[PDB]
Amino acid sequence: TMTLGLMRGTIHRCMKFNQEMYVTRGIIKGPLLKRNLEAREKLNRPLVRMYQRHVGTQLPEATRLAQGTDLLTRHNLHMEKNLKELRTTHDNLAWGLNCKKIGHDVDYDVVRLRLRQRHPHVCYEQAQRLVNDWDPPTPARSQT
Amino acid sequence: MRECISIHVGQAGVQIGNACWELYCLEHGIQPDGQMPSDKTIGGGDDSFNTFFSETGAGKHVPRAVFVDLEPTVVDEVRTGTYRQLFHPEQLITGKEDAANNYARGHYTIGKEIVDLVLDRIRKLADLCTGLQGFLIFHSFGGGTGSGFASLLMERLSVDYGKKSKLEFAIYPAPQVSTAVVEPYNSILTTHTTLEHSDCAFMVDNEAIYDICRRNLDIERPTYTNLNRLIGQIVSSITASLRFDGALNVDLTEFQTNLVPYPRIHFPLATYAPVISAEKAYHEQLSVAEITNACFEPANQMVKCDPRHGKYMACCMLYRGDVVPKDVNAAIATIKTKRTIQFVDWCPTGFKVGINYQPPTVVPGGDLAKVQRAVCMLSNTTAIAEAWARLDHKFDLMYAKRAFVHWYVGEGMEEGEFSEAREDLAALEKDYEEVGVD
Amino acid sequence: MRECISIHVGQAGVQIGNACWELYCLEHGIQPDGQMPSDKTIGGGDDSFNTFFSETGAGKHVPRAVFVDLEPTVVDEVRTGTYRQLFHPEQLITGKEDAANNYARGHYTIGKEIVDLVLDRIRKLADLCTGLQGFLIFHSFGGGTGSGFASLLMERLSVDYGKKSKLEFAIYPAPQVSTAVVEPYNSILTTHTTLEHSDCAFMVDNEAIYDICRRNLDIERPTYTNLNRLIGQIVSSITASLRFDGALNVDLTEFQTNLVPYPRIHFPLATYAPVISAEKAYHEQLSVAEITNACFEPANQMVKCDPRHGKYMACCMLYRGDVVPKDVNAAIATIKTKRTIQFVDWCPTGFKVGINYQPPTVVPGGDLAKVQRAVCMLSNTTAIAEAWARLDHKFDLMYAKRAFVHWYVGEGMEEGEFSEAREDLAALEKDYEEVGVD
Amino acid sequence: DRWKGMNREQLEEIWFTQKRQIQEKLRLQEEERQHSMDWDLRRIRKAHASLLHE
Amino acid sequence: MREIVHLQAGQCGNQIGAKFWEVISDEHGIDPTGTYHGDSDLQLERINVYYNEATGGKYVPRAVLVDLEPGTMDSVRSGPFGQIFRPDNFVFGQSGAGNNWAKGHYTEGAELVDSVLDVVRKEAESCDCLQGFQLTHSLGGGTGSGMGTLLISKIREEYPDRIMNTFSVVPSPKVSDTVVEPYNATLSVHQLVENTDETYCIDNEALYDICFRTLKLTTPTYGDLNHLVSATMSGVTTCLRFPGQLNADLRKLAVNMVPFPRLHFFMPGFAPLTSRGSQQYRALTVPELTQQMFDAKNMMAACDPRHGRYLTVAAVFRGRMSMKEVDEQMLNVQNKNSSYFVEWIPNNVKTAVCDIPPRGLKMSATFIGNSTAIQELFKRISEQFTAMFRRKAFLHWYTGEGMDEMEFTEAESNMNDLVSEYQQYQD
Amino acid sequence: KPPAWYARLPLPMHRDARAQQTAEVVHAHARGARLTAARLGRAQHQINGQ
Amino acid sequence: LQQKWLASKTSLKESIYTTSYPRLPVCAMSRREHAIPVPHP
Ligand SMILES: Nc1nc2c(ncn2[C@@H]2O[C@H](COP(=O)(O)OP(=O)(O)OP(=O)(O)O)[C@@H](O)[C@H]2O)c(=O)[nH]1
Ligand SMILES: Nc1nc2c(ncn2[C@@H]2O[C@H](COP(=O)(O)OP(=O)(O)OP(=O)(O)O)[C@@H](O)[C@H]2O)c(=O)[nH]1
Ligand SMILES: Nc1nc2c(ncn2[C@@H]2O[C@H](COP(=O)(O)OP(=O)(O)OP(=O)(O)O)[C@@H](O)[C@H]2O)c(=O)[nH]1
């Protein structure tokens, strides 16, 4: 049970890293609006190409652009593979919790019925009419 | 062309936008039906409305704003009102669950499956627009629903739209009045998330709004009708440059270039000078000199900040109505010669003037006076760090005694994010202090 | 000339063709008796009906369609309907025994003795026709009788006439809803049998058809009447090129050549953009731009696929109504340059436009909108493989524990080409990703 | 090749019939409400008589 | 949409539930027969938070009545509003309680919890998405405590994602009639604080005092006391059903109330209490309201927090008010009374204004209090518990039922922890 | 102040820095060319003299 | 003072929005004398 508290925080921090790296994707794949794109001096600034002029090879800014996009996509795959496993493991722990808890609860109502018949009163017939029904049988069987 | 889109996040921010959109129709010829009289102004949607409303070939003016809310009560109630036929049905973005004042609950639990829908709304509004200077974000710092949902959407609209302007307006937390002790928690959460994305954030406080009401407007028992009206006038004034013309016309882009000195800090202060009762305006006179003194009178600010405890950086004047540059340039020169007025030595000039000849109009069944000469006092001063100063020694207490954390850690946060903001704040005041040092 | 022969297999596929021919009679003004008014359009059968109806010397518009079913109930009901006098009696090929949802029972037990009967109908329809570009096949993958019966026929139709087109239309199985568990059995039997013979197979899924209806048409309780009208309008739109002309006229041959890239995969997806409610159309306006945004909006697709999880190859749009090329070519230029829409780089252009001047009309007793600018979006993407990917993991479990095999082995089968079916399927996904692999 | 589009007269004819369509759609609801509540009234009376017999 | 299903527990809530529901019906204007007289659109539109639609415009109360003694059921059934209640929801047992907590918690509950769980889940599926539940019962009430402790436990694992509101009355401190009542309360409160999230604390002696203080009518009926507590309970529920800018959700309220999970026990405060001449001798002003709202005599819950300090305070204002008066009244009281709050939290006020007045009066309100005034309560029961557990009187019954001393040890030990918990935080 | 900038790799604000990381090279060649523009321009000037 | 004395509302079940924002008279409407007048395109 102490563990059940512990993983949630890990999930809480694990999930947060994911959201802004999708944001980090947007902040590295443009704003996805060509018709506003120009106002930021459309990538290749007019000044750059007229700077080229004599030219003679160009800027490796496209190279880092490709490389940076490649990296973040890789990490995307890594976490998603790791993320999917986590929920599956969590639910197994969640399921195992339920089996453990219910197990003793059904087991619990055993000793108590005994002391209900030690008393100086009570005789034969009260037991047998109630032997077949002391608790609604239905061991709650995850009822829904 | 010259148009924009307004955003109204939080049920607190929807009755204000309601009033603003009520005000806007009171100068655009608008009838509650949705059409003009037989007079010819309808067409492809190109006239004074084309910047504000969308009156297509159907002849019905479609406002360029979206009301988003998460409690159906008010939004359905306003969906049954007088202008609801004008309001586009699902532009009135409603919700069935609240955020429990919890910024994160409004940012993580429900905002995921709702933002995609509103993202569809903005693009279908973005495409129909032509120039779309920017966005008019109406929210609130102490937002039960305004706080969390806005932060995600402003982030989402920032990443896909990172070039156009974004105008932010929120009721600032009352310095001494707190309807909720959870308000500071989310308020700093909003600020730190927005400092690196928000373009121009404008703040306001209701207490001194009320203080004005019984000082010169002389109303001891006003209402939001009055409260919503006056901020609606304020936003109407700043938008008058789009609606009308003047000796010189200015745009929001010039404001951001000239108002904010340095990055991060983008928190100027607005103020409307001719705030007076009708009878007081009746048997008295208005001119540039006294309204200039009034707009620089420290008690006329809706913000609890003493300008003599701070120092000025900017002062933007938007004169709407009949005025001439002569007395304007003469009066401001006297203001420059005033010694109590303490700008920083860094700025020789800090005066942004906008002249508009349209005389501000009254509202039917209104409370304002009869204005011919009006000005909005947009300024930034160093007397504002106390506002962030008061909340930290507020906040540092509760975080040390970690009140209500079980609520927030209950639905999935941790303390690191709360940690980050405090030195982010500690960075803010020292930046305020360092720039305050000349 | 420009005519075709329609085939309606399956008691599922019979109400739809009923509704389609009901729709088709309105635009031609066909009276239920079978004749025009005193207006002069009848003759040797040469006018707008000549492509669809056979209004011969008798003056009665005889549709060029055959309804085939294995249970007499619905067909005996429809032959007691309103237009039963229009319909040819034994063209309504009826049956007395069902296939019990079994594919091979409808393929072996009873189809032998009736295929010769219907083969008489087609050749007697073939002789009266002149150009007969192709055929209209309406079926269902989860065909209790549509699946098995059409399978033998189309094989017999392929062998005798392989020189013309065969157009296939079926309701795609609901990905998570299953009203039958033998449906995966017969469906994969249909797909593999049809892969090497079907010319153009088009699918639809009802769940999103429902999802649209309470999204924009705002009807929480529709019916087949609305469902069949939707698909009936879909087939009506694609047949408007045959009915009326346009700026350019396009034909299924051009559709086939320009839609299927390569062998096997001939399964694009259709979509209709101006699906909106009445009052929403009332106080709003339609134009090319927003319907172009709406047509490519992923939630407007009736098949549960995410285009961002796949990639585009072809897109065919059929503009029915009044449009000008100026806004058309401009809008698509924006669409081609759109970032999110991920076409395969193999195709520089993948756009096939069909202009039709005739505005789409409403049907009396209908619920659609009144569209002046309509479009049907025929497109094929790689985001479809998940459906068959969904299919196989359903099948691989079921088949390993070999449920209901006693039923199929009982009347003359065993598990043999149940195996070849899956690597025929497994061929499909690997081909789908290989073409996905650039 | 020269068709420049429809005229508004058709469009006014267009906008009107939807207004109609909504109206018969509204009564279609309302009449079904009547049809539904009739069944209950039949159920009320038959149940009442059953209690009389009991 | 979000709705509520109610529970009528114990034989006290049998009167309380009867009064609480008829107040709502009279508030919403439905006749006792159930055929609503359409008069107010807003209440017509916000009845679905509590009521479903039956045939012929009849509004079914989505509440459950449970007991063991049929006579109380017959009396409330024969009441003016028994017809609006359903025989489907009348779940009862074939036994007399003896008002034994353990018999109701172990013996008689076992064969009745199955039935009630089916009823509530049927009602749960009858609705879409609840806010949660509220329960009317007593902490010292033998049947209500016995079943409630069982039912609250079972509902927790069933739906740990909703509001488990509890409404229980504290028996008279001076006299308890039931001599084993201190045993019953100690048993229940152990599970209560463990299962509950909210708890309304109400005492009868103060209600008699309030009758003395303002009613001045000598001899009232216990239903009149039920009329008061229903009015208080109705007032807090007015927020959800009615429009007006006040954020209504109990979670919206609870997160404003609970800085630490153990804070479940809350104290009410109500709106103008008026005497025979003062109905027409009163100038109804927010000042004299707010004055009366914070009166040491206006309380009804347990006792004077004058002995302690004020942790969290929240008041809802029902009627035509405005932000300025409630603001300045808060300023007035904050300056009037600064030091007697805790320095742990300032600005401890939560303000809500319901613009819709009640029926009969215009300017009204309701207050909920969480102050350090529960220490007197459980310390009182401590000496009673220790004295009776000093010599184990009346213990053979529970041993006969299947009870032994061990469970009391942690029951009081947890209780002793809360005593130190309440003290040490404030002290 | 702890030393933080080492390499890692995540760069939430990266395009903007790279944009100014174009600013040095774009101006760099401009300075060198004007030096040549200096020597060529006067050269012809006094050349036209004689 | 005399008329207000009654202080007895007729329609107490009124939302402020209805009271605060009713339909305003048509003849009280502003005219656009100079609001960037561009009849020409
Ligand atoms: N903007 C605005 N604020 C108001 C008005 N009246 C009161 N307020 C204050 O504004 C705050 C609104 O914030 P929230 O309550 O969090 O609003 P929300 O996030 O949309 O969610 P709710 O709690 O349901 O309203 C309240 O705390 C009030 O103090 C008003 O008319 N407009
Ligand atoms: N095409 C069509 N399909 C429908 C209609 N209504 C329901 N359906 C779906 O279509 C399927 C019908 O296919 P089958 O049951 O195999 O039809 P069949 O082979 O002609 O013979 P039957 O089993 O007797 O109906 C059902 O599983 C439904 O899910 C409808 O009006 N038209
Ligand atoms: N209904 C009702 N209850 C009262 C009244 N006066 C005091 N009570 C108390 O309310 C408590 C709660 O009722 P229940 O929980 O239903 O009673 P119980 O479980 O059978 O156990 P008892 O306390 O012995 O009655 C009882 O313990 C009574 O002491 C009254 O006038 N009417």
Coordinates of all heavy atoms in Angstrom, one line a residue, chain E residues 322-346:
Chain E
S322 N -24.6 43.0 -3.2 CA -23.6 43.5 -4.1 C -22.2 43.2 -3.5 O -22.1 42.9 -2.3 CB -23.8 45.0 -4.4 OG -22.8 45.5 -5.2
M323 N -21.2 43.4 -4.3 CA -19.9 43.1 -3.9 C -19.3 44.1 -2.9 O -18.5 43.7 -2.0 CB -18.9 43.0 -5.1 CG -18.7 44.4 -5.7 SD -20.2 45.3 -6.1 CE -20.8 44.4 -7.5
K324 N -19.8 45.3 -2.9 CA -19.2 46.3 -2.0 C -19.6 46.1 -0.6 O -18.7 46.2 0.3 CB -19.7 47.7 -2.5 CG -21.2 47.9 -2.6 CD -21.5 49.0 -3.5 CE -21.2 48.7 -5.0 NZ -22.1 47.6 -5.4
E325 N -20.9 45.9 -0.2 CA -21.2 45.7 1.2 C -20.6 44.5 1.8 O -20.0 44.6 2.9 CB -22.7 45.7 1.3 CG -23.4 44.6 0.6 CD -23.8 45.0 -0.8 OE1 -23.1 45.8 -1.4 OE2 -24.8 44.5 -1.3
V326 N -20.6 43.4 1.1 CA -20.0 42.2 1.6 C -18.5 42.4 1.8 O -17.9 41.9 2.7 CB -20.3 41.0 0.7 CG1 -19.7 41.1 -0.7 CG2 -19.8 39.7 1.3
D327 N -17.9 43.1 0.8 CA -16.5 43.5 1.0 C -16.2 44.3 2.2 O -15.3 43.9 3.0 CB -16.0 44.2 -0.3 CG -14.5 44.3 -0.3 OD1 -13.8 43.7 0.5 OD2 -14.0 45.1 -1.1
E328 N -16.9 45.4 2.4 CA -16.6 46.3 3.5 C -17.0 45.6 4.8 O -16.3 45.8 5.8 CB -17.4 47.6 3.3 CG -18.9 47.5 3.3 CD -19.6 47.5 4.6 OE1 -18.9 48.0 5.6 OE2 -20.7 47.1 4.7
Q329 N -18.1 44.8 4.9 CA -18.4 44.1 6.1 C -17.3 43.1 6.4 O -16.9 43.0 7.6 CB -19.7 43.3 5.9 CG -21.0 44.1 5.7 CD -21.2 45.0 6.9 OE1 -21.0 44.6 8.0 NE2 -21.7 46.2 6.6
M330 N -16.7 42.5 5.4 CA -15.5 41.7 5.7 C -14.3 42.5 6.2 O -13.6 42.1 7.1 CB -15.1 40.9 4.4 CG -13.9 40.0 4.6 SD -12.2 40.7 4.5 CE -12.1 41.1 2.8
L331 N -14.1 43.7 5.6 CA -13.1 44.6 6.1 C -13.5 45.1 7.5 O -12.6 45.1 8.4 CB -13.0 45.9 5.2 CG -12.0 45.8 4.1 CD1 -10.6 45.7 4.7 CD2 -12.3 44.7 3.1
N332 N -14.7 45.4 7.8 CA -15.1 45.8 9.2 C -14.8 44.7 10.2 O -14.2 44.9 11.2 CB -16.6 46.1 9.2 CG -17.0 47.2 8.2 OD1 -16.2 48.1 7.9 ND2 -18.2 47.1 7.7
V333 N -15.3 43.4 9.9 CA -15.1 42.4 10.8 C -13.6 42.0 11.0 O -13.1 41.7 12.0 CB -15.9 41.1 10.5 CG1 -17.4 41.5 10.4 CG2 -15.5 40.6 9.1
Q334 N -12.8 42.1 9.9 CA -11.4 41.8 9.9 C -10.7 42.8 10.8 O -9.9 42.4 11.6 CB -10.8 41.8 8.5 CG -9.3 41.7 8.5 CD -8.8 40.4 9.0 OE1 -8.2 40.3 10.1 NE2 -9.1 39.3 8.3
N335 N -11.0 44.1 10.7 CA -10.5 45.1 11.6 C -11.1 45.0 12.9 O -10.4 45.2 13.9 CB -10.7 46.5 11.0 CG -10.4 46.6 9.5 OD1 -9.4 45.9 9.0 ND2 -11.1 47.4 8.8
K336 N -12.4 44.7 13.0 CA -13.0 44.5 14.3 C -12.4 43.4 15.1 O -12.1 43.5 16.3 CB -14.5 44.2 14.1 CG -15.3 44.0 15.4 CD -15.6 42.5 15.6 CE -16.5 42.2 16.8 NZ -16.6 40.7 17.0
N337 N -12.2 42.2 14.4 CA -11.7 41.0 15.0 C -10.5 40.5 14.1 O -10.7 39.8 13.1 CB -12.8 40.0 15.1 CG -12.4 38.7 15.9 OD1 -11.2 38.6 16.3 ND2 -13.3 37.8 16.0
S338 N -9.3 41.0 14.4 CA -8.1 40.5 13.7 C -7.4 39.4 14.5 O -7.2 38.3 14.0 CB -7.2 41.6 13.4 OG -7.8 42.6 12.7
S339 N -7.1 39.6 15.8 CA -6.3 38.7 16.6 C -6.9 37.4 16.9 O -6.2 36.4 17.1 CB -5.9 39.4 17.9 OG -7.0 39.6 18.7
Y340 N -8.3 37.3 16.9 CA -8.9 36.1 17.4 C -9.0 35.1 16.2 O -9.4 33.9 16.5 CB -10.3 36.3 18.0 CG -10.2 37.1 19.3 CD1 -10.4 38.5 19.3 CD2 -9.8 36.5 20.5 CE1 -10.4 39.2 20.5 CE2 -9.7 37.2 21.6 CZ -10.0 38.6 21.6 OH -9.9 39.3 22.8
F341 N -8.6 35.4 15.0 CA -8.2 34.4 14.0 C -6.9 33.9 14.4 O -6.2 34.4 15.3 CB -8.2 34.9 12.6 CG -9.4 35.8 12.2 CD1 -9.2 36.9 11.4 CD2 -10.7 35.5 12.6 CE1 -10.2 37.7 11.0 CE2 -11.7 36.4 12.2 CZ -11.5 37.5 11.4
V342 N -6.5 32.9 13.6 CA -5.1 32.3 13.7 C -4.2 33.1 12.9 O -4.5 33.5 11.7 CB -5.1 30.8 13.4 CG1 -6.0 30.0 14.4 CG2 -5.7 30.6 12.0
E343 N -3.0 33.3 13.4 CA -1.9 33.9 12.6 C -1.4 32.9 11.5 O -0.7 33.3 10.6 CB -0.7 34.3 13.4 CG 0.2 33.1 13.8 CD -0.3 32.3 15.0 OE1 -1.5 32.3 15.3 OE2 0.6 31.8 15.7
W344 N -1.8 31.6 11.5 CA -1.5 30.7 10.5 C -2.0 31.1 9.2 O -1.3 31.0 8.2 CB -2.0 29.3 10.9 CG -1.1 28.5 11.8 CD1 -0.1 27.6 11.4 CD2 -0.9 28.6 13.2 NE1 0.6 27.1 12.5 CE2 0.1 27.7 13.6 CE3 -1.6 29.3 14.2 CZ2 0.4 27.5 14.9 CZ3 -1.2 29.1 15.5 CH2 -0.2 28.2 15.9
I345 N -3.2 31.5 9.1 CA -3.8 32.0 7.8 C -4.6 33.3 8.1 O -5.5 33.3 8.9 CB -4.7 30.9 7.2 CG1 -5.3 31.4 5.8 CG2 -5.9 30.5 8.2 CD1 -4.2 31.6 4.8
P346 N -4.2 34.3 7.4 CA -5.1 35.5 7.3 C -6.0 35.4 6.1 O -5.8 34.6 5.2 CB -4.1 36.7 7.3 CG -2.9 36.1 6.5 CD -2.9 34.6 6.8

